[PDB]
Amino acid sequence: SFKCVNSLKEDHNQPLFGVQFNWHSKEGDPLVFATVGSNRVTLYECHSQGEIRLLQSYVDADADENFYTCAWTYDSNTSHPLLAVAGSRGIIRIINPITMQCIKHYVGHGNAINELKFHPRDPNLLLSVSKDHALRLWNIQTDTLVAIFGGVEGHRDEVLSADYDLLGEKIMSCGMDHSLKLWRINSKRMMNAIKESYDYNPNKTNRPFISQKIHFPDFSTRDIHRNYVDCVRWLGDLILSKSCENAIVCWKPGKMEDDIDKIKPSESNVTILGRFDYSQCDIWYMRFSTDFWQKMLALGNQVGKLYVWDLEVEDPHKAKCTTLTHHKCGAAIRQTSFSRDSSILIAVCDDASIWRWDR
Ligand SMILES: CS(=O)(=O)c1ncn2c(NCc3c(F)ccc4c3CCO4)ncc(-c3ccc(C4CC4)nc3)c12
Ligand SMILES: CS(=O)(=O)c1ncn2c(NCc3c(F)ccc4c3CCO4)ncc(-c3ccc(C4CC4)nc3)c12
């Protein structure tokens, strides 16, 4: 079980909106996590006796920038870790975490980015989610925009979150329009788009890289929540999503026995496999997280309380809850992150504080 071993506060005193452990850190090396808040990204190293060692920050040139999200990947030739960050400016930055240098940046239409996720099987494929109602898939090896997920049947308002399934064959996105949309990326069209993005070398051709515009999702539902869906994650062939109604719903498209890969775009049914209720987390912009093995689920609330569900149960509705409190932790917990071995849980707050819980 978890015990709070340390806490700290960042100098800017602004909320921390994101935290991510590097699950790509090498064997023997200490555990490293990134935090995002104000116009800054900061790296910390976890040590024994609850020590958190401050490393280095990337500070944006624009004092008005607000970083909302960050994601770890690695260089496809050298295996060296890389960090992607984005926020209110709508600029994706790829940072070398060693020197904290921005090595490259991407701009779509330049509208705020709410979330970044790297493909689970391809370190080069970066998904961004935006306030401009679209999702974008980038190939950071060839610096190309592979596809835009939006359009005529896409999200009708700001996209807040998205997630890849286990194999990275499909994406589930959600947002302010109350819907959850499924986008299949193993279609012939998307497989060909990805292949072509790898074959693109502008020094070797005349054609622009031709990005796909995907106007139609493979499934859509507004039957789960009755407000903004601000967080989504796959749990195998199941979905975990939350709104600001003090609940994470575990559901699936179609009827109970319907296979996710036989689901058609016209599908009108959803099946609810359970709901995890909690308290005082009815404000927008609160993220839940799972550990690497998806044995645990974590979410913080508006008043500094942490909830942890044990998912190692036969059916989702049988999950066992544990609550984590500390008399000095009273600010809203915006995001949590587990280390790869799930031995450490970091929570980040509205008052720029960082809390370390060791298993
Ligand atoms: C070899 S490559 O450079 O083309 C390549 N390098 C990486 N590729 C990825 N990565 C994402 C990925 C994945 F790694 C695992 C599961 C998954 C996807 C996306 C949909 O389902 N996807 C697709 C491809 C890919 C491969 C082969 C083909 C056939 C020859 C025409 N088409 C597409 C790919
Ligand atoms: C400026 S804004 O309100 O339009 C905004 N626009 C986008 N914002 C994001 N986006 C990331 C995001 C998300 F899309 C969904 C879930 C999620 C977060 C981060 C933690 O949990 N996060 C936070 C915020 C946010 C919230 C509260 C406040 C101050 C303390 C009162 N300021 C900003 C945000």
CA-nearest residue, atom 13 of ligand 1: 121
Beta strand segments in 22-76, E: 31-37, 40-46, 52-59, 67-74
- Biggest distance spanned by C-alpha atoms of the chain: 63
Residues 6+ apart with CB under 8 A from 283: 244, 302, 332
Distance from residue 156's CA to the centre of ligand 2 (Å): 19
Question: Residues with Cβ within 6 A of ligand 1?
Answer: 119, 121-122, 125, 167-169, 185-186, 191, 194-195, 198
Query: Technique behind this structure?
Result: X-ray
**Where on the phi/psi map is residue 204: left (φ > 0), alpha (ψ -120 to 50), or beta?**
alpha
Please choose from 14, 68, 113, 240 the residue to mutate so as to test ligand 2's pocket, defined by most ligand atoms within 8 A of CB: 68
38 lines ligand 2 (CB under 6 A): no
The 8-class DSSP code of residue 153 comes to: G
233 lines ligand 2 (CB under 6 A): no
Counting ligands in written order, the one closest to the CA of 171 is 1
Comparing CA positions, the residue from 154, 62, 173 lying closest to residue 114 is 173
- Show the DSSP H helices in the chain as ranges: 188-199
Resolution, Å (one decimal) = 2.2
Specify the 3-state DSSP secondary structure of 196: helix
Counting ligands in written order, the one closest to the CA of 190 is 1
Please choose from 118, 119, 122, 184 the residue to mutate so as to test ligand 1's pocket, defined by most ligand atoms within 8 A of CB: 122
Q: Is the dihedral of CA 155, 156, 159, 160 positive or negative?
A: negative
Classify residue 274 as exposed, middle or buried by CB count within 10 Å of its CB (0-12, 13-18, 19+): middle
Residues 6+ apart with CB under 8 A from 331: 304, 349, 350, 351, 353
Retrieve residue 128's tokens: 């961004």
Distance from residue 17's CA to the centre of ligand 2 (Å): 7
Distance from residue 53's CA to the centre of ligand 1 (Å): 39
Residues 6+ apart with CB under 8 A from 313: 319, 320
Distance from residue 70's CA to the centre of ligand 2 (Å): 13
Retrieve residue 254's tokens: 């179609």
Retrieve residue 49's tokens: 């006796």
Distance CA 182, CA 203 (A): 35
Distance CA 151, CA 129 (A): 14
Give domain limits for the chain. 1-359
334 lines ligand 2 (CB under 6 A): yes
Residues 6+ apart with CB under 8 A from 302: 280, 281, 282, 283, 286, 332
Yes or no: say if 186 and 193 are a contact pair by the CB < 8 Å rule: no
Helix, strand, coil % over all residues of the chain, rounded to 5: 5, 45, 45
Rg (C-alpha) for the chain, rounded Å, is: 20
Other CB atoms within 10 A of residue 252 CB: 21
